[PDB]
Design a binder for this molecule. Structure first.
Ligand SMILES: O=C(O)c1ccc(-c2nn(C(=O)c3c(Cl)cccc3C(F)(F)F)c3ccccc23)cc1
Ligand SMILES: O=C(O)c1ccc(-c2nn(C(=O)c3c(Cl)cccc3C(F)(F)F)c3ccccc23)cc1
Lengths: 257, 251
C-alpha cells in the first residue's frame, strides 16, 4: 500500500524470477536479434535430423516433437512451482488451494513466458540452442500441425506491449493468485494477496513504461486471450489420448480438469 | 484532464439513463421490496402469468435479447467519436460487443434466487431455471454464477455506463479495418472508468483491475453460449415457427 513497499515487492519477485527461470526474455532477445550465441535453425526434416547432432533435442517425427514439447512442459511446471513458493503468502495458504492455484495457473504462465521465446517466424528451443520455424510446425502431420499456431498468434500480439522481465515477474504472480479458480476453499486471503501484486504491477508499469498510456489495463486485457489458448490445448489433448497417445505424473494431475 | 474524465463520465451516465429503461438502481429496488412482480416458480405459475415449455422460455429470452440490441446500438451512438468511425468498423464492434454487454446488463436483473423479466414485471426463479430439459436449463446456470461474482463488485449505473462503453470499443475484434481510432477512444474510456471507480468506491482497492479481470469471464461465457447455440440449430427442430421469425431472431 506504500510506494516504497511496492517497489520492494517488485524487486523480490524479479529476484525469484531470475533465480527460478534459466532463460529470461533479455537472454532470448539477445539470441533472437543477433546481439553478440546464434542458434541452429530447424525448418524441415533434414534440418531436424541435422539438429540432433548439434542440440540435445528428442528428449515418428511429429510424435517425438510433441512428446519432446511435453517433457519441456514438465520442466516448466517445476520452475513455475518454485517461483510461486517465493510469492509472499502463497505457502501460507491452505494446501488444497495452493494445489488448485497451480492446477489452473501453470498453463497460462507457460504461454505467457513462451512468448518471450518467439517472433513472427519461429520459436527458440533447447535453452536457445535451436530455432524451429512456424511454417515447419504449421506443416506437421495429422493434428500436430496445429498445436503451436495459436501460441504464435498470441505472442505476436503479446510481444507488442514490449514488456521486460521485471514487468513479467509481477504479471506471472498475478496469474497464480487469482481467486476465480474453480474449487478454491478460501478466496478472501487469495484475493488479498493479489491486491498487493496488482498494486505493484500498476506502479511498476507506470515507472518502467511511463510513455505507455494505459499499459496496465491493456496488459490485464491480455488475460482474456491466455484463457482461450488453454481451452483449445486441453481439448486437442483429449483427441490424442484416444488415437495413439501412450503423460508425466505432474502432467497426469494437471489433466484432470 | 480530470475535469475531462468527469465530463466524459457524466455524459455517458446521462445517455445510459435515456437509452435503458430499467436501470440497475430501479431493478435492485424491485428485487428487495424497497408494485411486486409476478413470480414464476413452477409450471402453473407460468401459464397464469402471461394473461413445449423449455423452448417457449428460450425463444422468449432471445426475443427479449434482440430488443436490448436496439437499445445498446442507440447507446453506442452517444460514445464520443464512435459515430465518426468507419461504418464497417461500427457494425463489427456491435456485432461482437452486444453479447458481452447483454450478459453484463443481465446481472443487474439477477440475484441468488432468480431474475427480473419483462421490464421488471416478472421474476423467474433460479430453482425453476436450473431444472429444465437437458439442452436448455444448462445455458442458464453459468449466467447466474457469473452474475453473483459480478454483482459482488457492487457497481452502480454510472459505473456500468462507462464499463459498457469500454466493451464496445474493443480494438481486437476480428475484421476491424482501422484499429487506431478505436483504441484511442478506448484509452479515454479506461481513464474515465478508472477515475469513476476511485471516486465512487474510494474504499475498494484495485476495483478497476478487478473489473477488467471480469472481461475474461465474460468472453468465456459468450463462447459457451455461442457453442450451445450451434447444438440447438442442428438438434431441435421444433425451434422453427415462421421462417420469418427465425430470420428476425437468429442474430
Ligand atoms: O531439448 C529438448 O529435448 C527439447 C527442448 C524444448 C523443446 C520444445 N519446447 N517447446 C515449447 O513450446 C516450450 C519451450 Cl521452448 C520452453 C518452455 C516451455 C515450452 C512448452 F510450451 F512446451 F511447455 C517447443 C515447441 C515446439 C517444438 C519444440 C519445443 C523440445 C525439445
Ligand atoms: O428482460 C427479460 O425479460 C429477460 C432478459 C434476459 C433473460 C435471460 N436470457 N438468458 C440467456 O441465457 C439467453 C438466452 Cl436463453 C437466449 C438468448 C440470449 C440470452 C442472453 F440474455 F444471455 F444473452 C438467461 C439465462 C439465465 C437467466 C436469464 C436469462 C431473461 C429475461
Amino acid at each position: 500500500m506504500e510506494s516504497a513497499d511496492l517497489r520492494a515487492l517488485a524487486k523480490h519477485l524479479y529476484d525469484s524470477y531470475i533465480k527460478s527461470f534459466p532463460l529470461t526474455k533479455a537472454k532470448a532477445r539477445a539470441i533472437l536479434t543477433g546481439k553478440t550465441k546464434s542458434p541452429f535453425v530447424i525448418y524441415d526434416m533434414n534440418s531436424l535430423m541435422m539438429g540432433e547432432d548439434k542440440i540435445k533435442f528428442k528428449h515418428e517425427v511429429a510424435i517425438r516433437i510433441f512428446q519432446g514439447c511435453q517433457f519441456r512442459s514438465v520442466e516448466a511446471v517445476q520452475e513455475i512451482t518454485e517461483y510461486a513458493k517465493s510469492i509472499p503468502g502463497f505457502v501460507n495458504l491452505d494446501l488444497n488451494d495452493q494445489v488448485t492455484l497451480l492446477k489452473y495457473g501453470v498453463h497460462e504462465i507457460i504461454y505467457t513466458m513462451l512468448a518471450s521465446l518467439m517472433n513472427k517466424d519461429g520459436v527458440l528451443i533447447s535453452e536457445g540452442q535451436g530455432f524451429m520455424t512456424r511454417e515447419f510446425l504449421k506443416s506437421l502431420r495429422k493434428p500436430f500441425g496445429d498445436f503451436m499456431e495459436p501460441k504464435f498468434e498470441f505472442a505476436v500480439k503479446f510481444n507488442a506491449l514490449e514488456l521486460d522481465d521485471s514487468d513479467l515477474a509481477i504479471f506471472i504472480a498475478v496469474i497464480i493468485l487469482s481467486g476465480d479458480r474453480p474449487g478454491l476453499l478460501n478466496v478472501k486471503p487469495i484475493e488479498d494477496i493479489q491486491d498487493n501484486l496488482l498494486q505493484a504491477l500498476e506502479l511498476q508499469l507506470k515507472l518502467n513504461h511511463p510513455e505507455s498510456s494505459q499499459l496496465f489495463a491493456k496488459l490485464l486485457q491480455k488475460m482474456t486471450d491466455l484463457r482461450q489458448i488453454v481451452t483449445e490445448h486441453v481439448q486437442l489433448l483429449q483427441v490424442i489420448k484416444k488415437t495413439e497417445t501412450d503423460l508425466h505424473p505432474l502432467l497426469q494431475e494437471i489433466y484432470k480438469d
